[PDB]
Structure formats: structure tokens, C-alpha cells
């Protein structure tokens, strides 16, 4: 086994952890267990704390500093590693008891429990003209020594390591996404039936999505074009609520469906980040510093969820639109386009 290690600027504190990515199984989150090595030679305050922080990092638009960022703590937890207060005695994990043995009594254990219905680590895509730190939701464990919780923490007597709350594809695949819609126009009782379905419910990052379309046009109108588009939804709930839909993959096929005739075709799209770099704010999976990460994985909420969950809640849907001729009695005033949507799960398979 191997553990991650990071020391403070002057080397008096050193944080140890078994892993960076702590999986969220919906029903439980992997606990953040580790130790903090502090030599007595440098321990003068005689109080070492460890803190887990889930904060949303953002930039203010009015301010033109070019890189300035701010944090807003969504969830924060505290564990007094030293001195061990008599009203807190916890059993060390296998991981922890291996570490003390290796290092010694100067390595004080800490263990945090991430509660359910908290956001996963999601970083919003920065533009090319963005030099600050990564914006979005990110988890951070910060160890420091201070006389009390009131005192101001010195950056040299402290060390911060970034960690990620992640999720993976369900082991059981969900039901095949299928959706239908029928539009009836006033000119006559002839309907325009649109039927669409995806190949599977779960899709891994960078995999092809096949859309089986079947249009049955009995109307006097003609389908000029067919626009398929994989769209990324992102519900952001911090101070009031924002949301957006953005096409990460699309295709504008000029397949015509003449009046009183059927049509059937399979379209294949594949979302990838290269042809989406210019989309500032596009949700991406959590970044430790500034590496390239894939498109944000769909976040899985509980069934009987609490709702109004903080952070960023990303989803995906495939929209199948039909651009219809319009005209006639009403002219081009009334819209005749018919569209239907198909939700699907996009995320990484569980690593073994």
C-alpha cells in the first residue's frame, strides 16, 4: 500500500492520506481517514486541528482583477487531533494503525464523515484568459496548529491538500430511454408522430450514442431538417438558483420527410471536450489543480432525496427536434417544430 503525502512550507506539519478520490455510493461516502505528523520541536501552540471543507470557488464579474477568486463554505467539519479531549475516543482504522506504527505517536489520527446529499467535486471550465484557481465545487483538507478556533491561521503553520468526492456508473443499467410525441395541426386531423430512443441508458465518457429516430408524417407539412443534440444540464444552487442547457454534441441532418410518408434513421454522436473548449462555465469533473478533466459526469441523487442540494447538479439529455415547414393559413407566425428529449447517464465505470 501507498499513501499520499504533502508537507507545509516549513516542514513542521505533514498530512497523510490513503487516497485522494473518496467514492460516494449515495448511501455512504468513503471516510477521510489519515494522520498528521507534528514534531514536538515545532509544537509551541499545543493544539493541532484538521478541517474538511466543501467550498464553491467563483469569480465576481464586477471586479476586473483578472484571476481573483472567492470561496463560499457549503459544508465544514472540525476534528481536534491534539490534545485528545477525554470526551472523544475513536477506534483507529486499519489504515490509521499502520501509519502510527510507521511514523509514531507524533502522527495524530483524524477521520471525517461526509454526509449524504452533498455535491460532488465539479469544476467549471475556465476560459483561455483565466489565470486564477479552479472555479466550482472542490473538497479540501487543511491541517494547522493554533491556540484556539478564534486565532488567525498562519499560512506557514498550515498545509492544504485537495481531495475529490466522486461517483461511478450504476452496476445495473437503467431502462432504455424512449420517448414519443404526436403533434396535430388545425388544418386537418392528420398527426405528425415522432419516436426516438437511445441504444442504452448508461454511457461511458467518450462513447458513441446511437439515436434511433422514426417519424410518421401524415400532415400536409414537410420536415425540412432534423437536429439531434446531446445537451449538458447544470443546476447550480448557492444563492438562489441558476441553470443552463448547453449542446456538447450535435448534428443538423437535412433528412426530409415528405407529406404522407414515414422515415427511419439512426444517428450517432459522441461528446468530447476538444470541440467544446470555448464554452466558458461548462461543467467538468473535479480538478486537483489545473489538469484536463473530461466532461462533468452526471451526478446521481438519492430517490427520496432532500432536494435543493448545494453546489452543481449536472445531468444529460438528447434532444431530437424536427424543423417543420410552417406557412399556410397562418403564415410563418405559428411555430410547427416538434421536439422530444431523452435523458441518460454519463459517467465512468466503477474501477475494480
Amino acid at each position, epitope marked *: 500500500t501507498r499513501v499520499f503525502k504533502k508537507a507545509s512550507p516549513n516542514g513542521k506539519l505533514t498530512v497523510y492520506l490513503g487516497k485522494r478520490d473518496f467514492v460516494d455510493h449515495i448511501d455512504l461516502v468513503d471516510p477521510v481517514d489519515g494522520v498528521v505528523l507534528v514534531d514536538p520541536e515545532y509544537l509551541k501552540e499545543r493544539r493541532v486541528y484538521v478541517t474538511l471543507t466543501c467550498a464553491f470557488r467563483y469569480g465576481r464579474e464586477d471586479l476586473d482583477v483578472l484571476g481573483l477568486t472567492f470561496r463560499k463554505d457549503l459544508f465544514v467539519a472540525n476534528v481536534q487531533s491534539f490534545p485528545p479531549a477525554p470526551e472523544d475516543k475513536k477506534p483507529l482504522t486499519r489504515l490509521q494503525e499502520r501509519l502510527i506504527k510507521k511514523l509514531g505517536e507524533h502522527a495524530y489520527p483524524f477521520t471525517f464523515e461526509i454526509p449524504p446529499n452533498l455535491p460532488c467535486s465539479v469544476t467549471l471550465q475556465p476560459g483561455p484568459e483565466d489565470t486564477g484557481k479552479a472555479c466550482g465545487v472542490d473538497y479540501e483538507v487543511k491541517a494547522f496548529l493554533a491556540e484556539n478556533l478564534e486565532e488567525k491561521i498562519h499560512k506557514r503553520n498550515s498545509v492544504r491538500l485537495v481531495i475529490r468526492k466522486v461517483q461511478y456508473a450504476p452496476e445495473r443499467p437503467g431502462p432504455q430511454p424512449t420517448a414519443e410525441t404526436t403533434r396535430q395541426f388545425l388544418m386537418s386531423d392528420k398527426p405528425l408522430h415522432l419516436e426516438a430512443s437511445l441504444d442504452k441508458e448508461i454511457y461511458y*465518457h*467518450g462513447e*458513441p450514442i446511437s439515436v434511433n429516430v422514426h417519424v410518421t408524417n401524415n400532415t400536409n407539412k414537410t420536415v425540412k431538417k432534423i437536429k439531434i443534440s446531446v445537451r449538458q444540464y447544470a443546476d447550480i444552487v448557492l444563492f438562489n438558483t441558476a441553470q443552463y442547457k448547453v449542446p456538447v454534441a450535435m448534428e443538423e441532418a437535412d433528412d426530409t420527410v415528405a407529406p404522407s410518408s414515414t422515415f427511419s434513421k439512426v444517428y450517432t454522436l*459522441t461528446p*468530447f*471536450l*476538444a470541440n467544446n473548449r470555448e464554452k466558458r462555465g461548462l461543467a467538468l469533473d473535479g480538478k486537483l489543480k489545473h489538469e484536463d478533466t*473530461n466532461l462533468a459526469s452526471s451526478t446521481l441523487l438519492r430517490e427520496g432525496a432532500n432536494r435543493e442540494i448545494l453546489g452543481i447538479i449536472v445531468s444529460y439529455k438528447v434532444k431530437v427536434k424536427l424543423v417543420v415547414s410552417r406557412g399556410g393559413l397562418l403564415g410563418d407566425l405559428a411555430s410547427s417544430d416538434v421536439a422530444v428529449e431523452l435523458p441518460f447517464t454519463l459517467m*465512468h465505470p466503477k474501477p475494480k
Partner: antibody
Amino acid sequence: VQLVESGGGLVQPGGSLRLSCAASGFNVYSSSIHWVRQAPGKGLEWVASISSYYGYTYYADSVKGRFTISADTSKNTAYLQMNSLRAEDTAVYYCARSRQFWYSGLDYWGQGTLVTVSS
Amino acid sequence: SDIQMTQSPSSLSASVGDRVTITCRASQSVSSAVAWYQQKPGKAPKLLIYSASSLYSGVPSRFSGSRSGTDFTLTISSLQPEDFATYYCQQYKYVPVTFGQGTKVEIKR
């Protein structure tokens, strides 16, 4: 699943030659195609790599400026244009797939086409 | 100015049923990002082990790897007629990814 190489032969020094690697059973955007060079009895050497999901190219310093790695996603084939060729570059060139999420070695290789450079 | 891989053996000889170990020490700390390959004459290489210790799918359970600072080792519990070929150690933390010289494994007689 398979990787089919093509485009090998004899070319004089300074000339050019282009390789093709057709893929089957591998999604282009969930993979990263690689190129490896081995002379007879000399060992393996990485020369180039293409990441089609992020859209990035990588080359060994020896090859920087001389070769160029490309790929037609629609045709599921990865090409390598080799310009200003040299006798050093005489070798069997292998094509190797890699998992994009995430790199766990070079799980599959092709038989490799014989490339020979000499006057 | 690149990370090179040095396989400690040159040519290993052993009979069928032996426990063979191939050591490979990298130039600097490449973390647990190391792999091993097998190349028969006239054939392309096959991936054996990745992530220093993790075994690849379809590879027999006899092969196993282990990390030790900069030294990474490939091991086999019992040696079989299918295992007689050359071996290569790889690293893939930083680019360029480099390979070892090679260890000629052969049947004892």
C-alpha cells in the same frame, strides 16, 4: 478487436512515407492511439501519441518537427506522416491502443509494418 | 534529460517450473506507473502488468509485480512453456514513456 498497419516500404533518406492504423472494436474518443519504433534487436522506443478526446499531439524530442500524428475519427484510422526520413528511423513501427479513462499501459498492439530507409 | 529504464538482468536462464524475477530501476521517482511486456520473436508485444502491481485481464495468475522505491520487479511462481520470451519494463508517469533494454528468458537444457 484489431489494429491493422499499412504503408511500409523502402524510401531514400530525406524522403517521406505515411502510415495508417485502422481500428476495430475501439471507440476513437475513448482511446489514445500510439506509435512505437523498434529496430531489429534494439528495443522499443516511443515516437508519437494522439489523444482524440482532448485533441492533443505528443512527440519524442528526436521526432519533434519531423513527423506528424493525425487521425480520421470517421474512418477510425490513425495516420503518421514521416518527413525528412533518416537511416536511424529504419524499424518495424507498431500501433498501440491505450485507454483514455485512464491510461493503464498499452493493452493492444498491431503486427507492425516494416519501414526501411536507405539510399 | 529523460527518464530511462534499466533492467538489471541481461539474459536469464531457467528450467520449466522456476521462480524467475526481473528487476528494473527507473532513473527517478515515477510513482506506481510502471508496466511489463512480453515479446516473442516476430510478434508484437503483449501487456502483462500495469500500475506496477495490478494484473491485466486475460494474463495468467502466475505473473505478479511489486514496487520498491525506484525498483520494480516482475515475478512468476511457476515457469511454463508459454513464458519463454523477452521482457520489457515501462514507465508512464511523464512523457516521453521509455522502455528497458530487455531480458532474454530461455529454456534450460
